[PDB]
A paper describes a structure:
The X-ray crystal structures of a catalytically active fragment of [name] was determined to 2.7 Å resolution (data not shown) and an inactive Glu645Gln nucleophile mutant in complex with unhydrolyzed LacNAc to 2.2 Å resolution. This polypeptide had five distinct domains, four with immunoglobulin (Ig)-like folds that are arranged to create a nest in which the central (α/β)8-barrel domain III sits. The positions of the nucleophile and catalytic acid, Glu645 and Glu564, respectively, in [name] are conserved with the analogous residues Glu537 and Glu461 of LacZ. Notably, however, there was no evidence of bound metals in the active site of [name]. Indeed, the side chain of Arg288 occupies the space where a Mg2+ atom is bound in LacZ while Tyr713 and Glu716 fill the region occupied by a Na+ atom. Consistent with this, the activity of our catalytic region construct displayed no sensitivity to the presence or absence of metal ions (data not shown).
[name] is specific for galactose β-1,4-linked to glucose or GlcNAc [lactose or N-acetyllactosamine (LacNAc) motifs, respectively] found in glycoconjugates. The N-terminal region of [name] comprising amino acid residues 138–993 has amino acid sequence identity with GH family 2 enzymes. Through detailed structural and functional analyses the molecular basis for the catalytic specificity of [name] is defined and this activity is demonstrated as critical for the ability of pneumococci to utilize complex N-linked glycans as a carbon source and protect the bacterium from opsonophagocytic killing. Further analyses also revealed the presence of non-catalytic CBMs within the C-terminal region of [name] that mediate adherence to host cell surface LacNAc and/or lactose.
Numbering used by the authors: 138 to 984
The structure:
């Protein structure tokens, strides 16, 4: 057997099962299951598919605007498939990355399983339900989203990938590989012992003789070991065993967040039955170590870092709940451009895409199992299943759904270098230190530790922000490895004095609210300002925050000033559908999406993105300067809110540079210098006129034209510019390509921005013009967005098949997915009385 053949076997082991499904909302259960159903009345599609995202907004929706005002319901999905002749005796497993929710899977008329969880991955061995002789089988999936189930937009149905594993009767079982590097800090400059465990099952009714062979390789690289073999032993029929080996890898490269292409490795497993290669598998992993102390916080590979982190919902804007590798890559790559090193998957398990991209980009991950325990937060959420018996075929005796779901998530991610924290709850009210909650936290911690001891078990708790933060809930925190504070910076000092051994971080911070390109009262701090005068908008100066919240500056400066507060996960990294605080559940208002994000649903940064970048990215890696606001102040209503007593517009610069000099129409308004300072522990930092300003400010009398900012190093040498220009009346639509080409695989996509521009090419920053889109060629329009919270516009096509969307504050995005045919597609944009534009994107070979 050649290495070529082994790799093919690995590749053939797992396939994409997303293709050729039929969908019908409210379909008849008996017809969906039955062998030769009439599917003329069904919709033929490829997964993932979120059915909720094609709905219109409904002011009367049971989801309410916390759930995006997009309705759920019930639906069936249907696939028919035949095993190849070679595969007839093989074991067949079906994996669903996420189905929301309350699902039932039927194979040839029989119920394989019921699975409540809407975010956790699950698989079924469906071998026994398959027809003999290679006759076609029918798989039918029932998904139910009965509202309200969610405190944010969930979507409905099969929003994540479905995959099929076809294997020998003797095979490495699902989630069966464990890779550990116990002595890595010690052995790192020499040979590092890599302990691998394999969990092999014999589904045959004959006994077979078993050997495992292991090799490690650099991902997209060379081998770093030879073949290492376990001793031959008998595996009895219908039994499973665990195999072990140690492999030595010399001076491996350590996975870190300190570069954007961190080192990854792959374990190759070969399984022999009676001396014949019958199974082959690869498992992604990395070499990293970390430590965390109460007063010094966190270090990765001996380097002290803070969690510069974001909370993220799953949700892709116009894509709705449909997960996509390219969409998630763009979101995460962009987070990383800001200086983010850490994401929290709030509040639910992550997709395979998110976990993989995080390993690929160098982002530390906290994956969260639960938004509630046994109490519940919404009637149709998970709370009702939490203590009920798992009915999964492969559930262990006495396992509750919470037990089974937590276990399986940890087994799925135990080898992923990115994950360093497992969260067993967010804002669990019932976790107050009573006997029941105390029992429950211990049970849950123990589930994890029976699988994985290497990662921090944690929770995100807002109980610490009430009063002095102390209470029976402190007893629950005692059971955790690390204790997450939600919005509790005010009680940290006291809580820290009380619990000197606690490892503390901000599990949820800020909740500042902003609308891109919208400005209000920069001079004030606005607390939960949801009045009619706000016009359903919040300020991009970043001076709006909810009642329990903090601004970016307040929340970041605190984190920065305290070593024992290890970092934070800001709410939120990007906008999501739903939860439109400060207009939460005011359902007759137009708001349907969040204000919390640093970036809007359209992927377009708000100004605070640049504030964070100035703080988190070194001037060596990326010198920058960013100006706000815009320079169009002709409109008196707009200006009356921004301009001060003398009618000057406060202009502000974010920079990681030493100084910024602002020019109006070529004339200097003065050079200003950041004040340099040190943390009590000697970390160096920069700030402005005072401790509450991380920016430089100029009060500028409004003269139309150009503002330009020159950023300089200490030598007085220019390292960065930014520039803002007054726009004229809209003259045209401009389309901006992110990608010159994408892959022709039917999965890759591109984001093209549309701007409303004047005759000189300046973006009109106030423009809300409606744009109509045409697509020709080898592509599929799959979304449109402008990020605006108060918009009730379709994200998808209109009822007549049209694609339209307004600009909001000059900008928006359109999303095009590739087909499986190489060639090109062209996007033309039109707006009324404006010039049109087109860009062409090529589709073809990959990478």
């Amino acid at each position: 057997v050649t290495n070529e053949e082994v790799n093919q076997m690995i590749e053939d082991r797992k396939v994409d099962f997303n293709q050729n499904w039929y969908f019908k909302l409210n379909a008849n259960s008996k017809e969906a299951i039955k062998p030769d159903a009439d599917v003329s009345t069904w919709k033929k599609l490829d997964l993932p598919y979120d059915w909720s995202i094609f709905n219109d907004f409904d002011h009367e929706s049971p989801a309410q605007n916390e759930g995006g005002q997009l309705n759920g319901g019930e639906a069936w999905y249907r696939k028919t498939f035949k095993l190849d002749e070679k595969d007839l005796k093989k074991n067949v497993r079906l994996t669903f990355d996420g189905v929301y929710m309350d699902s039932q899977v039927y194979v040839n008329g029989q119920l394989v399983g019921h699975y409540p969880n809407g975010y956790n991955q699950f698989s079924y061995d469906i071998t026994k339900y398959l027809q003999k002789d290679g006759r076609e089988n029918v798989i039918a999936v029932h998904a139910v989203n009965k509202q309200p189930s969610s405190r944010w937009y969930s979507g409905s149905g099969i929003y994540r990938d479905v995959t099929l594993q076809v294997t020998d009767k003797v095979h490495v079982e699902k989630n069966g590989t464990t890779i550990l590097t116990p002595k890595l800090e010690e052995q790192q400059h020499g040979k590092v012992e890599t302990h691998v465990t394999s969990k092999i099952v014999n589904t045959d009714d004959k006994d077979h003789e078993l050997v495992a062979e292991y090799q490690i390789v650099e991902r997209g690289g060379h081998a770093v070991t030879g073949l290492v073999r376990t001793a031959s032993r008998t595996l009895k029929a219908h039994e499973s065993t665990s195999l072990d080996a140690i492999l030595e890898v010399e001076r491996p490269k350590l996975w870190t967040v300190l570069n954007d292409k961190p080192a990854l490795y792959e374990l190759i497993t070969r399984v022999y039955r009676d001396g014949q290669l019958v199974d082959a598998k690869k498992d992604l992993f990395g070499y990293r170590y970390y430590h965390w102390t109460p007063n010094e916080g966190f270090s990765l590979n001996g380097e002290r870092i803070k969690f510069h982190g974001v909370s993220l919902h799953h949700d892709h804007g116009a894509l709705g709940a449909e997960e996509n590798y390219k969409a998630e890559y763009r979101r995460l790559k962009q987070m990383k451009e800001m200086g983010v090193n850490s994401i929290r998957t709030t509040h639910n398990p992550a997709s395979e895409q998110t976990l993989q991209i995080a390993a690929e980009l160098g982002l530390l991950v906290q994956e969260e199992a639960f938004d509630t325990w046994y109490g519940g937060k919404k009637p149709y959420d998970y709370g009702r299943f939490f203590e009920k018996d798992a009915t999964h075929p492969e559930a262990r005796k006495g396992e509750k759904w919470s037990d089974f779901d937590l276990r399986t998530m940890v087994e799925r991610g135990k080898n992923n270098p990115a994950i360093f924290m497992w969260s067993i709850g967010n804002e669990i009210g019932e976790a107050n230190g009573d006997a029941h909650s105390l029992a429950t936290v211990k049970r849950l911690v123990k589930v994890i530790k029976d699988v994985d001891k290497t990662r921090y078990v944690t929770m995100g708790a807002d109980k610490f922000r009430f009063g002095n933060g102390s209470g029976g809930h402190e007893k629950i925190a005692d059971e955790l490895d690390a204790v997450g504070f939600n919005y509790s910076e005010d009680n940290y000092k006291a809580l820290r004095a009380k619990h000197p051994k606690w490892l503390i971080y901000g599990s949820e911070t800020s909740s500042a609210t902003r609308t891109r390109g919208s400005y209000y009262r920069p001079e004030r701090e606005l607390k939960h300002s949801n009045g009619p005068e706000r016009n359903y908008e919040q300020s991009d100066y970043g001076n709006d925050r909810v009642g329990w919240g903090k601004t970016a500056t307040a929340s970041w400066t605190f984190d920065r000033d305290n070593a024992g507060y290890a970092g934070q996960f800001i709410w939120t990294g990007t906008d999501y559908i739903g939860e439109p605080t400060p207009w939460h559940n005011q359902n007759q208002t137009p708001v349907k999406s969040s204000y919390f994000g640093i970036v809007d649903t359209a992927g377009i940064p708000k100004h605070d993105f640049y504030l964070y970048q100035s703080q988190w990215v070194s001037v060596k890696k990326k010198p920058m300067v960013h100006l706000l606001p815009h320079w169009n102040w002709e409109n008196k209503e707009l200006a009356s809110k921004v301009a001060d007593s003398e009618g000057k517009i406060p202009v502000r610069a974010y920079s990681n540079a030493s100084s910024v000099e602002l020019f109006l129409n070529g004339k200097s308004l003065g050079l200003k210098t950041f004040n340099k300072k040190q943390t009590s522990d000697g970390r160096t930092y920069q700030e402005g006129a005072n401790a509450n300003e991380l920016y430089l400010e100029w009060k500028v009398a409004y003269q139309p034209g150009t503002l330009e900012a020159i950023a300089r190093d200490e030598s007085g040498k220019e390292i960065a510019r930014d520039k803002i220009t007054t726009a004229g009346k809209p003259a045209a639509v401009r389309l901006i390509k992110e990608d010159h080409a994408i892959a022709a695989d039917g999965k890759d996509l591109t984001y093209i921005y549309y701007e409303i521009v004047d005759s000189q090419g300046n973006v009109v920053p106030t423009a809300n013009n409606l744009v109509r889109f045409q697509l020709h060629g080898q592509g599929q329009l799959v979304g449109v967005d402008n990020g605006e919270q108060a918009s009730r516009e379709r994200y998808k096509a209109q009822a007549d098949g049209s694609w339209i969307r307004k600009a909001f504050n000059g900008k928006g995005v359109a999303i095009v997915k590739s087909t499986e045919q190489a060639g090109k597609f062209t996007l033309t944009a039109h707006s009324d009385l404006l010039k049109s534009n087109q860009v062409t994107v090529f589709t073809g070979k990959k990478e």
